[PDB]
Amino acid sequence: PKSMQCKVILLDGSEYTCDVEKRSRGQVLFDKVCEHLNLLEKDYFGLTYRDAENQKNWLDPAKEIKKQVRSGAWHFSFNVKFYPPDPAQLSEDITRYYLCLQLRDDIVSGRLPCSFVTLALLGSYTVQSELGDYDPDECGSDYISEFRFAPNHTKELEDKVIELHKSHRGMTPAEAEMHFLENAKKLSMYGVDLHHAKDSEGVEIMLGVCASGLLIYRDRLRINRFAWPKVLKISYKRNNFYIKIRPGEFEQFESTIGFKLPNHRAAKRLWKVCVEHHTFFRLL
Ligand SMILES: COc1ccc([C@H](N)c2ccccc2)cc1
């Protein structure tokens, strides 16, 4: 029985190596990684790989790994797939911990924009969780943390993290992580998966997929939101992605909004993440 070496980038930035049989489905590898992480609330997470066009793809746990990675390396990342709107409802602290690590990367990467004050507050909870109570002995007037907090660090930001850290004395890691999440969950881009697209006129937009529905990001005076219930069907054809939008009560017919994606693979990717989000948040 022939086994393939898998390398998985974990949310702490470390690399986990394991083997699976070469005809293994994604679920096999995912189960191994989750056991390694002592993670039980697995439904919110997934593995990603980079395709031949270097796009992030979710590893489908139901399909053979080899038919997804195809010509590429068996190299993956462990990631949050479904960001819970209410992380306080998660059963386990360790689930909230992995969600925090994901969100820290979302912030540093600039995928999750955040005000100065919220960057400093989130950073102050991370420090409290990781180091415990504020200590002046490690932190002088010239202190810069090893913790990456933001896409662009300033001395201002470092000072504000310390000021807020001082206020968190006696806070345990689980408590600090829960505060981190109570703040992060409110950010307008929390758990929004963004896709580049053109509207039916050829104007460049962004489509965002998240718990509440589908968002269209245009000129920035116009953001359209379609709650999952208002979305009757989702489809793709060639480079095109279509959503059918329910009639307003006493309307005879549904409306169709068409979008142009970069290529067929990008349209299929968007369709699959929309279907998955619609199912997940319909049931949650
Ligand atoms: C992490 O976010 C959630 C997790 C579980 C639920 C679940 N359906 C529920 C609803 C109501 C009361 C208790 C459990 C809901 C949200």
From Swiss-Prot:
It is found in: Cytoplasm, Cytoskeleton; Cell junction; Cell membrane; Cytoplasm. It comes from the Eukaryota. Expressed at high levels in brain, with lower levels in kidney, intestine, and testis. Detected in lung. Residues 4-284 form the FERM domain. Interacts (via FERM domain) with CADM1. Interacts (via FERM domain) with PRMT3; the interaction is direct and inhibits the protein-arginine N-methyltransferase activity of PRMT3. Interacts with PRMT5. Interacts with PRMT6. Tumor suppressor that inhibits cell proliferation and promotes apoptosis. Modulates the activity of protein arginine N-methyltransferases, including PRMT3 and PRMT5. This is Band 4.1-like protein 3. It comes from Homo sapiens. The chain holds residues 107 to 390 of 1087 of the full protein.
